[PDB]
Amino acid sequence: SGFRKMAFPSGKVEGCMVQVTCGTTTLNGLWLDDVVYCPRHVICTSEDMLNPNYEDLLIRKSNHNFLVQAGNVQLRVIGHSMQNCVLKLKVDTANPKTPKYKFVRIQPGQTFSVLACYNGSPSGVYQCAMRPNFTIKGSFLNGSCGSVGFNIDYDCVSFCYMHHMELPTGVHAGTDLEGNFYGPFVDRQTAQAAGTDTTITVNVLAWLYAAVINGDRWFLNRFTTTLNDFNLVAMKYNYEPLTQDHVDILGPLSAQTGIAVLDMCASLKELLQNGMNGRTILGSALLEDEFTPFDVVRQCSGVTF
Amino acid sequence: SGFRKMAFPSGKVEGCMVQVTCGTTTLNGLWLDDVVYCPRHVICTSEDMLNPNYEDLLIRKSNHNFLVQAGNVQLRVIGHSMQNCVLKLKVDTANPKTPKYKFVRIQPGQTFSVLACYNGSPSGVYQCAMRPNFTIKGSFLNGSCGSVGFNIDYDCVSFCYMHHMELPTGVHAGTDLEGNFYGPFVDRQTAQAAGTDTTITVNVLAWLYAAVINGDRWFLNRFTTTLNDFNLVAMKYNYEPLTQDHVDILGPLSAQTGIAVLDMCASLKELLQNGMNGRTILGSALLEDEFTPFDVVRQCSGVT
Ligand SMILES: *[C@](O)(C(=O)NC1CC1)[C@H](C[C@@H]1CCNC1=O)NC(=O)[C@H](CC1CC1)n1cccc(NC(=O)OC(C)(C)C)c1=O
Ligand SMILES: *[C@](O)(C(=O)NC1CC1)[C@H](C[C@@H]1CCNC1=O)NC(=O)[C@H](CC1CC1)n1cccc(NC(=O)OC(C)(C)C)c1=O
Ligand SMILES: [Cl-]
């Protein structure tokens, strides 16, 4: 009973957060086995940030220029390399709190938990989606760089995001853990703009199913729609196209509620055309698009880690 | 920048969660030093639940009847006692991951993080406010009983909530860690219902300050209101009276933004009377009342 934006328990990731210092710049690192991952811009001065030549700045660094701190303990750096926009610091000590893990690159619309950290100390946890324009709507201040985003599958932590920068209107950009940016962004202090964002239609439908599971039924209408007729209306309201793959993915939620996906689409089409008329769904006055179908099943069925 | 509903990092609490089984009832316990804390209704069959005589039921139990599992390890129960609605199981092993901690009783309008657990395994974390009607708007399924709520202050975990029950309207009730219910609720199967709730005025103002700090400022106006004139309008909308103590508690946010509390109250009065006319504040189409002034300061100033 009840429905909440819910993060993964952060304990497995908290035990991996360290502080990385290079001269005057301090940010967060992820310590897995004997490697610390962090944003490469830890090596820049504010001067360098405008247009850094990262390969050139790193040549000028030595193992000893990297101060890595895990609580009270300094970790000795015995090697360093750059992969894309991340620095990999080889340390002489493997993290005893290393969980089972993998690095994954997520798709727009997929959700993940962020452990917000400052000076290598976990400060807060919240749930985000990769927006269709490859930004995230985060909460990050100066010091938060190297904070990571993740999912848990049972006891396996999938790292999908590392935080690098803030874009116009207070949205955020970062990389996967191989250091490749999500979206066309670069780690430089330079005018950059995200594309126009859109609503994650498959997620809105997942959340209408969550609504029915939780006893909110008012928006259910007597109609069905074709996928074509649905997309004609959705594109008019800056919704992502709904694919057959999306219809097929909503199948289990459809079976749970006895409401055909295209009947739920006809209900969404009416909400977009008519609005909600001052009414709420699951305590929201707008349609929520940061719950995946898996997130809804997770929460409504209580899967654990 | 940016502003999100944010929970505390849950790791210190995850290291305390165990499974407690008595007969066919499995729920969650909190393992601190050599004591496991859980809801006393772990001892009931649904038979027992109409008016359970917990004192009698507990006398009839053996330590052996309490199966306590911490991951792969069974903890030997060597004693049991009841404090209010909480069962205390003495175990032969002190939890080595016991954090620095306190038991606190929170006030209506204050917030805390919930670690939702099933079978002693953490499932998710989210933020809740203790509502003025002593309920919480949580997300809890069968097996969630014994999940706890907490705040972290530096390295100290303040445990404030243990989950016992769901109410009509999809809201939740539970106890502090001494087993005293928040609100007039009782741990038995008897029809029960929350009082009428009210909106936490000081929290809505905190959140409007969070919006301004983040550059969401369309709702600001050149007008001011007296405290009385504010309370005359807002109380018609079922808002808590704004007191001078509330005005003082907002002092840091008022000083940070340079917007006097009674300046900001003229915004809120206009939002209540006219609505948002299709706009959002921090991506919400409604006024949010589950952020305390401390929550906004914490998040906008990055305390760790
Ligand atoms: C990150 O480097 C960090 O936390 N550094 C530690 C102190 C040493 C920050 C995190 C951001 C600060 C505010 N919010 C954030 O998310 N990242 C940066 O400062 C960026 C580094 C560059 C990519 C390499 N960064 C630098 C300069 C400007 C900006 N953004 C910016 O000006 O945003 C506008 C105003 C929207 C254009 C930036 O993100
Ligand atoms: C709790 O005891 C639990 O998780 N037990 C473990 C499975 C063995 C549950 C938690 C709730 C189940 C669904 N969501 C929850 O939050 N708590 C209870 O079942 C209550 C136990 C009583 C306090 C001692 N409880 C018992 C009977 C009825 C109800 N509520 C109820 O019927 O609510 C309606 C359906 C909204 C009227 C209840 O919460
Ligand atoms: Cl809303």
Q: Give the three-state DSSP class for B155.
A: coil
Structure tokens at A57: 């700045």
Contact A127, A6 (CB under 8 A): yes
Distances B252 to A18, B134, B209, B265 between C-alpha atoms, Å: 31, 28, 10, 16
- Name the nearest CA neighbour of B234 among B189, B195, B271: B271
State the first-to-last Cα distance of chain B, in angstroms, to the nearest integer. 16
**For residue B81, how far is its CA from the centre of ligand 2 (angstroms)?**
23
Q: Which two tokens stand for residue A142?
A: 């100066």
- Cβ-based neighbours of B304, under 8 Å, separated by 6 or more: A117, A118, A119, A121, A122, A123
Short-list B99, B140, B134, B118, CA closest to B10: B99
Q: Domain boundaries in chain A?
A: 1-14+100-197, 15-99, 198-301
Helix, strand or coil, per DSSP, at residue B159: strand
Q: Would you call B71 an interface residue with chain A, using a CB distance cutoff of 8 Å?
A: no
Residue A227 host element (H or E): helix A227-236
Which of B195, B207, B206, B186 lies closest to B132, judged by CA? Answer: B195
Fold match, A1-14+100-197 / A198-301:
no
Look up tokens 């006895």; give the residue. Answer: A258
Q: Does A217 touch chain B (CB under 8 A)?
A: no
Burial of A64 (0-12, 13-18, 19+ CB in 10 A): exposed
DSSP A136: B
Query: What token pair was written down for B240?
Result: 């808590």
The closest of B269, B270, B250 to B260, measured between CA atoms, is: B250
Ligand nearest to the CA of B164: 2
Residue type, A297: V
Task: Return the residue matching tokens 């811009």.
Answer: A41
3-state secondary structure of B262: helix
Residues sharing a CB contact under 8 Å with residue B80, sequence separation 6 or more, in sequence order = B58, B61, B63, B66, B87, B88, B89, B90
Question: How far are the Cα atoms of A2, B130, B136, B197 from residue B237, in angstroms, in the given order?
Answer: 24, 20, 21, 12
Q: Which three-class secondary structure state does DSSP give residue B17? A: strand
The total of other beta-carbon atoms located within 10 Å of residue B278's CB is 7
**Among B117, B145, B160, B265, which one carries the catalytic annotation?**
B145
- Residue A278 sits at φ, ψ, to 5 deg, of 70, 10
CA distances from A303 to B11, B116, B119, B121, B169 (A): 18, 11, 10, 10, 23
Which residues from A are below 8 Å from B214, CB to CB?
170
How far apart CA B204 and CA B163 sit, in angstroms, is 26
Which residues of chain B neighbour A3 with C-beta distances below 8 Å?
Answer: 139, 170
Q: Classify strands A17-22 and A66-70 as parallel, antiparallel or unpaired.
A: antiparallel
Superfamily of domain A198-301: main proteinase (3clpro) structure, domain 3 (1.10.1840.10)
Please check whether the domain covering A15-99 is classified as CATH 2.40.10.10. yes
The Cα–Cα gap between A57 and A65 comes to 12
Q: What is the distance between the alpha carbons of residues B86 and A95, in angstroms, rounded to a whole number?
A: 38
Question: Up-side HSE of residue B261: CA atoms within 13 Å toward CB?
Answer: 24
Interface of B with A in 155-174 (CB under 8 A): 166, 170-172
- Testing the interface with A: which of B3, B6, B19 to mutate, by most A Cβ within 10 A? B6
Amino acid at B57: L
The set of residues, in sequence order, having a beta carbon less than 8 Å from that of A70 and lying 6+ positions away, is A18, A19, A31, A95, A120
Q: What is the CATH architecture of B1-14+100-197?
A: Beta Barrel (2.40)
Q: Residue A120's closest CA among B304, B42, B93?
A: B304
- Give CA B7 to chain center in angstroms: 11
Find out whether B182 and B130 touch, Cβ atoms under 8 Å. Answer: yes
